[PDB]
Design a protein around this ligand. Structure first.
Ligand SMILES: CC(C)(COP(=O)(O)OP(=O)(O)OC[C@H]1O[C@@H](n2cnc3c(N)ncnc32)[C@H](O)[C@@H]1OP(=O)(O)O)[C@@H](O)C(=O)NCCC(=O)NCCS
Ligand SMILES: CC(C)(COP(=O)(O)OP(=O)(O)OC[C@H]1O[C@@H](n2cnc3c(N)ncnc32)[C@H](O)[C@@H]1OP(=O)(O)O)[C@@H](O)C(=O)NCCC(=O)NCCS
Lengths: 160, 160
């Protein structure tokens, strides 16, 4: 019943609205999500249920180090959380030919974001892949006026 | 007196504030600009004057077609406009080894954005490089609630 597909530029508004409706502090412009759909969609995925976008994942292969897949946004609509949708987006993304050759997954996860931590660490555990945590982007790096949590870096791999 | 350098993740807040202060509808998250500084900085540039960020350009090499450099954001602080700063950012970006092998520059420019149109078309004219305009992202693609201009696609090249 949930379908997993690539986003397209035409999806940018509905992906933006999905992320907007999470309340995320890390919402990008609509234009950004349009561009992802046209230029990065080999490393992104949408989950849709009965026509509604219910999930999104965006990643890029690092320009300098293309064996690194950096996952920079994952979102599932609240009404559809804790049903395995993010896990299926992540697992599906990695199973495609576009991710052949990825040896590390890297992402940031705030200390309070248990859901995301378990998404990534559960994927690593499933595959018996090591994980480490380093400094990422501390709270103090963010603009004054808008409190943000620390964003430590999760490095998952090597996967081969 | 203006210095042209790569952004770093530590610059993300000041780049965000620069773009915020333009009033652009296409402002991304602070986190986005942090990521650009760590992962895309071979295809970005900052202009700084007496320690203040006064300009920014962000681009990526298209994953599917790395001979295409897509320029997705250019901003100069109002007080420093029409002094050649964007032209120097763009020209400097293309002169680096990181852009060796770029054969096309692609970007979107609204019909009313003469400044940006002249930035790009003036760069093409300087180099006697052809340019074409196609459909890009129309106004109707953007979220209801926030009126956006059409974003036609400019394709500049081949440069070789
Ligand atoms: C993170 C998020 C995408 C997870 O989506 P989801 O579809 O609900 O996740 P899943 O159901 O696939 O679960 C993934 C794992 O996390 C666990 N999990 C999920 N939500 C959890 C919660 N609230 N508490 C504890 N564990 C949780 C699951 O048990 C599963 O673990 P497993 O791999 O050991 O089985 C979702 O909570 C979300 O959108 N959060 C807001 C946006 C966000 O913070 N994104 C990440 C930063 S960009
Ligand atoms: C577009 C922008 C970056 C240009 O920066 P800038 O440093 O003022 O531009 P420059 O001084 O380098 O000028 C570039 C060219 O545009 C012309 N130009 C600049 N501003 C102009 C204006 N307001 N009207 C007409 N021509 C203008 C220049 O004469 C020059 O032309 P040339 O190449 O034929 O000599 C700036 O106007 C800006 O930040 N705009 C708001 C953000 C934006 O719209 N960005 C683009 C979309 S992401």
């Amino acid at each position: 019943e949930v379908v997993y597909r690539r986003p397209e530029a035409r999806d940018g508004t509905r992906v933006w609205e999905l992320i907007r409706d999470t309340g995320s502090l890390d919402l990008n412009s609509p234009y950004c999500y349009m561009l992802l759909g046209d230029y990065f969609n080999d490393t992104c995925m949408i989950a849709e249920h009965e026509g509604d976008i219910v999930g999104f994942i965006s990643a890029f292969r690092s320009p300098r180090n293309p064996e690194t897949l950096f996952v920079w946004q994952v979102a599932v609509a609240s009404s559809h959380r804790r049903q395995g949708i993010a896990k299926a987006m992540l697992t599906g993304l990695m199973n495609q030919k576009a991710c052949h050759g990825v040896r590390f997954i890297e992402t940031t996860v705030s200390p309070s974001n248990m859901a995301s931590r378990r998404l990534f660490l559960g994927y690593a555990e499933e595959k018996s892949i090591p994980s480490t945590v380093t400094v990422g982007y501390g709270a103090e790096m963010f603009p004054d006026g808008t409190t943000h949590e620390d964003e430590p870096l999760f490095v998952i791999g090597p996967f081969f």
